[PDB]
Write a protein that binds this ligand. Structure first.
Ligand SMILES: Cc1cc2nc3c(=O)[nH]c(=O)nc-3n(C[C@H](O)[C@H](O)[C@H](O)COP(=O)(O)O)c2cc1C
Ligand SMILES: Cc1cc2nc3c(=O)[nH]c(=O)nc-3n(C[C@H](O)[C@H](O)[C@H](O)COP(=O)(O)O)c2cc1C
Lengths: 211, 212
């Protein structure tokens, strides 16, 4: 139906155990409520196959750029290169992206990087210039991130690396709108944890009405 | 014996196909020449199992926090939890870290994140304080050899650099008083200078190896 949305989560736990998954689920449920015709796909990076770039991938790709045909690749190469192609094609096919992550050591879980590596593809999300130009000029994106401490303000802002990275990628891809929604401070101020969660949930629902 | 050095690589390919790995090899070979008694340990992130923190890990951890013995965890939980514990212990036990990576999409391969995740442990590499945190690796030092197609050491692309930037944040977090970089950069942007770029970086690696 009218827009395709990728709800992309990088968390091993669910909405009952995670600040990020709780806020993301509030967002996405509300979104669907408001845009009942839209195709909303949950991409759970912990459950799906998300191949890291490895020796097989490089081999396979080498092959393909040497004119060979997908048929010439080894089994394992086909499995991996193939999946990478599905992932990539699914990404460009969608209209909106919603990234949901916990902050682990100032950034996101490793699989989020695997996911990015799988979708950053010449001719699909960007193309090179006589630097590069992003092809995703009419997409839209949102990052929901949970963190123990505050990283929106203060000295600690300089250490934020998750959102920062995603912002860089979005820029690279030419996506003009990248929003952030943070559930921050629950670990630094645990008496405030319920309040922090509730307000983020409320912001998330509100944001869903417009995204 | 002597000093314990972790030579940490995040690459599927080897010294013959990789700029980072070639430069890293020059570095660490020289290091061992200069410091023959030092314990140089290759941590090959594409050969070791570096468990991502997953459902099994949270479960296993929670169990241990709940008083269960390690042997009471599931087979899977035990494998992952034990593996992470080893990685963590190994990191703190070492005196020096050498990170070698390619730049993929402005940062490093996913497994490098896994590795960091495995070694970032409260009471080991840092401690929480009512004021934030404090680093515990006050006697360590680190170097990062990074390879990239284009140039990230100036100007506008420098704001896009995220690999070295990340490792710098982590090292600061850990309280590591010294973290250096060595870049092999520009080889794709200016392929008619790739050989020279490489040769120069290799020379730098050999030089730097005399002090690290
Ligand atoms: C492995 C790990 C690493 C973490 N690293 C950080 C960090 O660098 N900064 C921070 O403020 N909080 C950190 N935390 C705390 C979490 O960010 C916090 O619990 C947040 O709610 C995580 O999201 P979740 O609740 O969706 O899991 C970390 C937690 C874990 C388990
Ligand atoms: C998956 C992938 C992603 C890459 N991303 C970037 C990038 O963001 N910026 C860049 O300058 N070069 C990029 N490159 C090119 C490499 O950084 C360059 O080839 C470098 O020499 C890689 O190190 P290596 O020779 O040790 O493998 C990328 C290459 C690959 C395979």
């Amino acid at each position: 139906h009218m827009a395709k949305v990728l709800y992309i989560t990088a968390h091993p736990l669910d909405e009952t155990q995670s600040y990020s998954m709780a806020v993301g689920k509030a967002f996405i449920d509300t979104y669907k409520e408001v845009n009942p015709n839209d195709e909303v796909i949950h991409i759970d990076l912990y459950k799906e196959n998300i191949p890291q770039i490895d020796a097989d991938v490089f081999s396979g790709w080498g092959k393909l750029q040497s004119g060979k045909g997908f048929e010439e690749l080894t089994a394992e190469e086909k499995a991996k290169v193939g999946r990478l192609a599905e992932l990539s094609d699914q990404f460009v096919a969608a209209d909106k992206y919603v990234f949901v992550t916990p902050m682990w050591n100032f950034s996101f879980p490793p699989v989020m990087k695997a996911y990015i590596d799988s979708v950053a593809v010449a001719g699909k999300t960007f193309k090179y210039t006589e630097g590069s130009v992003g092809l995703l000029t009419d997409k839209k994106a949102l990052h929901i991130q949970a963190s123990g401490g505050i990283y929106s303000e203060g000295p600690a802002a300089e250490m934020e690396m998750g959102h920062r990275y995603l912002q860089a990628i979005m820029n690279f891809f030419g996506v003009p709108s990248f929003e952030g929604l943070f559930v921050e401070g629950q670990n630094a101020m645990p008496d405030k944890a319920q309040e922090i969660k509730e307000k983020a949930i409320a912001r998330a629902k509100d944001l869903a009405h417009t995204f």
